[PDB]
Design a protein around this ligand. Sequence first.
Ligand SMILES: [Zn+2]
Ligand SMILES: [Zn+2]
Ligand SMILES: [Zn+2]
Ligand SMILES: [Zn+2]
Lengths: 606, 606
Amino acid sequence: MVRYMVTSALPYANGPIHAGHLAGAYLPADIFVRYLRLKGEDVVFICGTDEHGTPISFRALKEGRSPREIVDEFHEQIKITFQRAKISFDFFGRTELPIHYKLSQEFFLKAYENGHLVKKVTKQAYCEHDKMFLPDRFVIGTCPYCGAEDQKGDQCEVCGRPLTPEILINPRCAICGRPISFRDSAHYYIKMQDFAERLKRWIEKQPWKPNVKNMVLSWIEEGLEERAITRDLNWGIPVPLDEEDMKGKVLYVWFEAPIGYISITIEHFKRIGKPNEWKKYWLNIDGQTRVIHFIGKDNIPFHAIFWPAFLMAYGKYKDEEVEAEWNLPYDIPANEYLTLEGKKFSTSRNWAIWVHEFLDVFPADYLRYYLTTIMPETRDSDFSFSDFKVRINEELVNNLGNFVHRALTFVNRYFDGVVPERGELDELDREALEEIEKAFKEVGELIMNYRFKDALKRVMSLASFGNRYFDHKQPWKTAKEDKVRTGTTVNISLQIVKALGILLEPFLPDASEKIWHLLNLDEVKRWEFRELPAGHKVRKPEILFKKVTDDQIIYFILNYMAKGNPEGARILLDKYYKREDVIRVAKEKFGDEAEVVLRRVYKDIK
Amino acid sequence: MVRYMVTSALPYANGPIHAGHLAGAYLPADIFVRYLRLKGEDVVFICGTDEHGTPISFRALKEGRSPREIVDEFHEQIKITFQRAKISFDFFGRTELPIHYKLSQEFFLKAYENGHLVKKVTKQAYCEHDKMFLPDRFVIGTCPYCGAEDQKGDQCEVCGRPLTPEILINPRCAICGRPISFRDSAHYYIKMQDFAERLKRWIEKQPWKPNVKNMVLSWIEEGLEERAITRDLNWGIPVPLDEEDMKGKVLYVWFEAPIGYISITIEHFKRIGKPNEWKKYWLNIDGQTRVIHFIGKDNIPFHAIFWPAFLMAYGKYKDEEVEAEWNLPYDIPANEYLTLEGKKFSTSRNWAIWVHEFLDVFPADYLRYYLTTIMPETRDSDFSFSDFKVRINEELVNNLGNFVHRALTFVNRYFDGVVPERGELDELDREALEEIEKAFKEVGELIMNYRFKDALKRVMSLASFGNRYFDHKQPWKTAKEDKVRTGTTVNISLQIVKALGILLEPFLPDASEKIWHLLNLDEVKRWEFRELPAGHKVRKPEILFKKVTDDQIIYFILNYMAKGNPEGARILLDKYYKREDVIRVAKEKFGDEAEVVLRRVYKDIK
Ligand SMILES: [Zn+2]
Ligand SMILES: [Zn+2]
Ligand SMILES: [Zn+2]
Ligand SMILES: [Zn+2]
């Protein structure tokens, strides 16, 4: 019996998360883990904020704040956001945890000890007016492909994606604009080549899709250049070595980050009261823990190559309990990117769907539903507002919500909300109870295969099946002729609602508890279905979902989207709506300030 | 060995919580429970949203939304807010839980069964244009003391506090203004008189303060009028009785609400995996569970009289395990009200400090610190912005934060962050380690006595003691003469920081983890102090707290306070600040909209 150690790529504590992030590695992981829990399986779901690296440091000088100040701010912002998103991480830690410092440092020390490292002195950047080295994101120059002013790290705003700090033209320190200087420095490196073979061999015998497995093999087919794992940063985890040359140096966040996956788990079992249980999840003791890594496509290389090697370089974990080895990525589910109304998410262009903002106007189920509806699985998908409301209202409201409502509304009208007893069953009755079985079976398999968009579809169809059932069983007619008959229809219909109650859970937790209350159940939610007993008391018909409005979308676009990118807003607005309508919404939404918005989006209007 | 069943008054799901609420019953409870946990004691901390009652129903017709829609919205808003507030409820449920429905209904049925009830028909309100009864908050008329138009429930906006629905002049249904009608109805009542004696007797033998114990006794000294526990509402828990007269009737929220205290706990142990542990907390088995009820003064009567009786009326709980009785309120800590800048919190006047808004500009420690600083213990206290910043900056920043910073900054300057070994100890060294003991001892006692304002003070003084220590031990001098000496000072100083790390926890969780990371500790936080070992590696000097700004307060007042109550804002602004300063802050804070604010607060300015 396998147990599961599930993680989600650590979000960087330099900003808030957007739907691309969620759709990319959190929502999938949540859907998967919830399922596993309903299955009764043994799974741990971990995550936390990545709090080191040049960026965070950069931003600190930028806003004149300590790197600690900002990560403390974003850890809270993100942890709460995930709670809002209903992402059930068993624990959400942070790489600022003392234990992370200890484990990373050990990790590095284990690499020292197995001669997988190599000190090296290189000539590198510097500022004399600021008396400090100038790592990655401090580069401030022209581009490496196109030629634009001011380019940092490796993302751009031009065409540029990945522009090493040196291929940049006119190197000038970002902090003060002083043209860079060159001071040589010492850093330790990892002889990745030491694991190329062992890696390739391991990758061979593994259930990953060729589109990855292979491309990975290729990438390895040409040596692994010794990568540096140290940095000249004033923020981060100190390199253990007590020498004078390694003073004021830190472990490349690039190296310690993944170790966070273990650090946090350990932290989890500590505070949970069972200090040593973590060992069975990350250590290959009587080996059989499937370690899953939900990530974004960009993380495949790292997770299928370097991270595994970092683990190997620590050959032996060993004290007071088995000297076993670290497990390796069982699987590394990755998702493509997400676009917004035809364009890519852009923090620069301030064009994205921020979870915390979006969740201010729409319920979590809506964001979770639609996003799974467009899960960037095999390719990229495009978030669209017209697409969003239409799927919710047409699918979630008109179908799932509709069925549930009808069902209850009937058991309440003809039986005073008491579950009728079932008489003989004809073909449909027989087929309906079978469909319930089919769903549980198939949805479960689709999930274990990372086919969420299709898994959610299998569920919606069951609701679709329920509607049909009702539509052509006509309880409103049958009730004026054959009581017993209607009783069956009704009882059967509710069975489908209870089932839809458990099946939905992994996808929409809230619409799940909503249904459970309507059915009035204490029953611990589980994947093994059990019919609703006759004589069971159900609650009065409530509503499941309220249709998305244009008033809402406009309010959203105007209130968030707009200031940050007025043109983006304007283009969206007079693309879906008439200006005479937006004004009205704006007027009856922003009181004595509506006017100082409309003019802000529609360049000139007064 | 006692275990503790701690609760906080269920917040009503009709709106967000404000500092008065927090200061009144949540913050106290949190400080108490955290302590208990650090003490290693066995405590359960429960709470959830009260989701029934006329109000919620009212609001529903008001905004044309189902009562369920709104409670779902506020349960999320409040649960997240509490997370933001760092209130560690072991579980935050809701009275919409199926189990609540079951337990309440049983409770009522147990009262039926022990003849503590009495059906009665009364002539009551109605609307014929709306074909519905008109309970409490539907009353819409002139006042009962002063004479003002439109008065609902029992709170006012005039002078009025508690105006029974009938003493109101010109009774007109609130929904449509149609002057009320009178249709007789049947409701069950509880013969409170049946418990007067048994109550008074119980209250006698109990450790409550006379100012309560007595006033309670008086209140009881004149019969307990049979109170109605049923209602003509379409939203709520159905009365079990299957009769045609009790159809469409519900249990007065007033009756079921407290039962939520048990419902949720049960729900807690269910989902936690240990289904039956709840029995030992609410049932008096081998009796010794101290049940504490953190509430507001307004709740004393209810919690010391009716709630206990409701418990008695259920004489026997009994199946498959001991037929024991429900425990009774061990203690019922209550706090006075809170005022804002000299005036009372007012949802009507839109004058209050909303936790979720306030926590958008200031860290949770700041709100928790200041509020405990003004805990409405023996009387009412007044929240004030000048008072807020001054205490934070002068106390939290300049003292606690200052000490911590100095300490680390030294162990890092003269020992490369490594804990020095202690040599001979003189009087101060000896006294310093003793002070640490004293603090733990006294703070702990002050907490167990609900003396938080003083408990927090005992802690700040320890930090104050640390500063003095340092000030007159002069490490910066001693380091250029006697190494060993400085080592002691330093080692000692850090002991005080680690201690301040645990002591703070109950009050400021974040400044607590901040200190723990600086000290670089894995050690599970506990109330039993253990010195920092020599040779221990501490982190580089960070900052603990950033001083509150005027830019912040103005931004807050302008961004939240203002629209909702522009006059309130204006009066605050040009009372603390010059208009030429507010403008600047407003201009460099609201970009292209600053102008449409300043004019909104300062009536005319252009
Ligand atoms: Zn470029
Ligand atoms: Zn510079
Ligand atoms: Zn009045
Ligand atoms: Zn009316």
